[PDB]
Amino acid sequence: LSAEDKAAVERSKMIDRNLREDGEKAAREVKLLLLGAGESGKNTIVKQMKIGIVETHFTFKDLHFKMFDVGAQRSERKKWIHCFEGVTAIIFCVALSDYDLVLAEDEEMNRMHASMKLFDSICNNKWFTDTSIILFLNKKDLFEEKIKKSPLTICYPEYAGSNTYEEAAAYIQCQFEDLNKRKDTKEIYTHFTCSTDTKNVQFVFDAVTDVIIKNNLKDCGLF
Amino acid sequence: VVPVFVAILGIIATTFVIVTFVRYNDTPIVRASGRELSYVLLTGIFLCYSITFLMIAAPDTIICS
């Protein structure tokens, strides 16, 4: 082996060392996929987490998150959805103050029905069979102020319940957690977000920590 | 005689625990208990009554060892 070849092997070993260090660094970060409707309050939640694709790094209690967002990607989701098979969790927003509205100029489509359809598609996808979901049900104050004048019968014909923030919110929540047909592999963490909530980072921290511990226990065959 | 029947009952109980854990291998309670180490710990429990039988035996060159 010539001296030049020895120099080449030296350089290759340096490159391998650098790549190993970078991979070990990248393996310890939480990767989140932020999904939701355009007007579902994604921007406010993004703002209160951090104190084509848009990336937002943020740290909480000595742990790191990257939090990818794909809202501005108007194309077929089946083509690029498999790029997110190995993410830690999926965050999904609903915007409860949408049960008496219409979208996409269809003029016969409840916004919340479209949200349920999207949730059903994402939850029962082939690439996401063991990925937990954090469901934020936000704009609850508008729901509280609105529920008096308009009942839930516009969005749900069968309600058999009272018009109060105590029972309608729970009714909407039990609708979304009943579309999950994989109850023995994943779970849904539901939280009610609002303006100046300031307590959503900790909820995400708790959910992701539980997810990590459960994954590690399942790998050991200990769960 | 008294240690002998005490040890025999200990052996029977340990055997019952081992058999039930083998028959219920995949249940959550059994899997949460560290099966592969549970069997080692149960072997450790099983050895002691055999130790009783060894100490009651007649001293020899093999039995001292």
Side-chain angles (χ1 to χ4, degrees), chain A residues 109-126:
Chain A
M109 191 62 153
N110 189 19
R111 280 180 151 100
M112 185 179 288
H113 282 143
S115 291
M116 302 177 80
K117 182 175 73 175
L118 201 74
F119 187 86
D120 204 358
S121 178
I122 301 299
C123 194
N124 315 301
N125 193 338
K126 67 184 289 184

Side-chain angles (χ1 to χ4, degrees), chain B residues 3-65:
Chain B
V4 167
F5 85 84
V6 172
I8 279 177
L9 275 296
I11 297 169
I12 290 172
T14 306
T15 315
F16 200 85
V17 169
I18 292 177
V19 163
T20 198
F21 269 41
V22 181
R23 294 178 65 88
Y24 288 115
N25 210 8
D26 48 51
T27 60
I29 295 176
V30 177
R31 185 179 296 113
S33 86
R35 292 162 285 169
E36 78 276 10
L37 303 177
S38 287
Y39 295 123
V40 186
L41 188 153
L42 288 161
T43 58
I45 286 178
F46 199 98
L47 282 196
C48 313
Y49 314 100
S50 312
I51 304 305
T52 300
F53 280 103
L54 275 172
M55 305 294 291
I56 304 195
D60 279 323
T61 310
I62 62 170
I63 277 171
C64 291
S65 294

